[PDB]
Amino acid sequence: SLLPLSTSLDHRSKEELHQDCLVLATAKHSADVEERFHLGLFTDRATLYRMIDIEGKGHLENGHPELFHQLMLWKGDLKGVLQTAAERGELTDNLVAMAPAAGYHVWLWAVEAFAKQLCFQDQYVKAASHLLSIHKVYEAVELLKSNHFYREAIAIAKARLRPEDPVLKDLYLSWGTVLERDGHYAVAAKCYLGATCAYDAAKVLAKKGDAASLRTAAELAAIVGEDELSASLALRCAQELLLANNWVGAQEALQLHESLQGQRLVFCLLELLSRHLEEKQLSEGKSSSSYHTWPFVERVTAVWKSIFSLDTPEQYQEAFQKLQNIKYPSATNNTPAKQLLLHICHDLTLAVLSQQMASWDEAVQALLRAVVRSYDSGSFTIMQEVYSAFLPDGCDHLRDKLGDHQSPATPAFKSLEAFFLYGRLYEFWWSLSRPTEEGERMLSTFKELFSEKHASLQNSQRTVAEVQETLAEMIRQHQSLPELTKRLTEANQRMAKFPESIKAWPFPDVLECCLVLLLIRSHFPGCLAQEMQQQAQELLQKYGNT
């Protein structure tokens, strides 16, 4: 198998095996031996060497370089064999294993040469293993790292290098950066943990945005310290867990850091209100609403006393102070229907809380802030049921406590009562349509809703916001005028003359409240609405043409 050409040649016919012997006989006792190279096994070294490198060329021109190198070993030029195979890149486990015959340094050169060759054949782990035998750990780690064999690079670095070697620490960070790039956040968190940088591990887990990922990042943060980070992470998990109406999942995430104690009350009020809402909307419902098993205002106070131990007024203040600091954005018209309700419930929570510690002034301000938020977002039905839940009877039972010119917060009381009548008037309107029992007695109570000062001021803010759109239109088109400045003076100077109270507290659109009353009035002939119809008519003319 290793000398195949001569093996067949000496198996020829006896015709050519007889001239073969006589050529051999003559040689011992010379161009006739040239043709018969197979007689090298019997004559001398020189003809045997010529014999061996004719089986060489023939192990190459057959596709068996492994046999060619084995033949070259017999001649005794092992050092020269490796260099030849190095140039043409046919080094193998067999060749390197025979390398130390020439010498140790020949083996040293052979493995590095074999390592370089194995790289070009996409054999990187094997190449790195050979580099380890040369006692080149840093080169082996660098070679694997540069080819994104991070798992194998770490294993060799972990086993061979010290745990605190900067080479090892960088491997985790380098691998974590790659894994984080393509959405493998969970594993990339472990790489940062291995890199003894725990803070970055929690944040990477948070970057997923998933509810479970948010929770585990919060728990992971708490283990390594990072208490202020854990609270922020747990809160975000709870906010995401109400997006699926998981009211038991949401409240457990708030049990992590115990600085969320203030936010626990909000999610309790948010849950009970949402139960109060979906109940009297479709008279029944089960929409994966995972409720707990625990007068609306007294119903949340009772639950707060039991489920959260909020009985004595000592910690009413701490809950109030911990909650009054947090502010939310302006809550524009477009906003998720679940986050918007949470923002309202935060202001509602302060309202009931202030009601507990006889803080009537802040109670109306917190209530007003909750109503306004809902009104500003256009969610009229939510604004209406807030009054139903928190002011079930009316609004006069708060006037005696503070509204009798007792505190400077009664301007805020007027806004809250004005918004209450706004819903009452709208309701009275839809009652006239398909979806008199209300009685005219109640109709002559919206008189406070028709405030000329609030009507004029909302008219002034209309032109000013309009003026800032006529000019902003013209400068936009660039890429009546003299009176336009004058009309600002008619308004921008006018609303400056009002008391600071008028501009401090919002009001319902008096012009809109004047449309509905006239519009409602169009169903009942022979009413005349006393002076109320005329006053609404007069107000419409004065601020409606503009």
Author numbering: 847 to 875, 884 to 1148, 1155 to 1295, 1346 to 1389, 1430 to 1496
From the publication, what sentences describe this entry?
Gemin5 in the Survival Motor Neuron (SMN) complex serves as the RNA-binding protein to deliver small nuclear RNAs (snRNAs) to the small nuclear ribonucleoprotein Sm complex via its N-terminal WD40 domain. Additionally, the C-terminal region plays an important role in regulating RNA translation by directly binding to viral RNAs and cellular mRNAs. Here, we present the three-dimensional structure of the Gemin5 C-terminal region, which adopts a homodecamer architecture comprised of a dimer of pentamers.
Consistent with the result from the SLS experiment, G5C forms a homodecamer with an MW of ~750 kDa. For each protomer, 531 out of 663 residues were unambiguously built, with several unresolved loop regions in the structure due to intrinsic flexibility. The N-terminal region of G5C consists of α1–α18, with α18 packing against α17 of the solved TPR domain (α1–α17) to form an extra TPR module. The middle region is composed of α19–α25. α22–α24 constitute a helix bundle, with α22 and α24 packing against α19–α21. α25 extends from α24 and connects the middle region to the C-terminal region. α30 is a short helix packing with α26, α28, and α29. The loops between α26 and α27 (aa 1294–1345) and between α28 and α29 (aa 1392–1429), as well as the last 12 C-terminal residues (aa 1497–1508), are invisible in the structure.
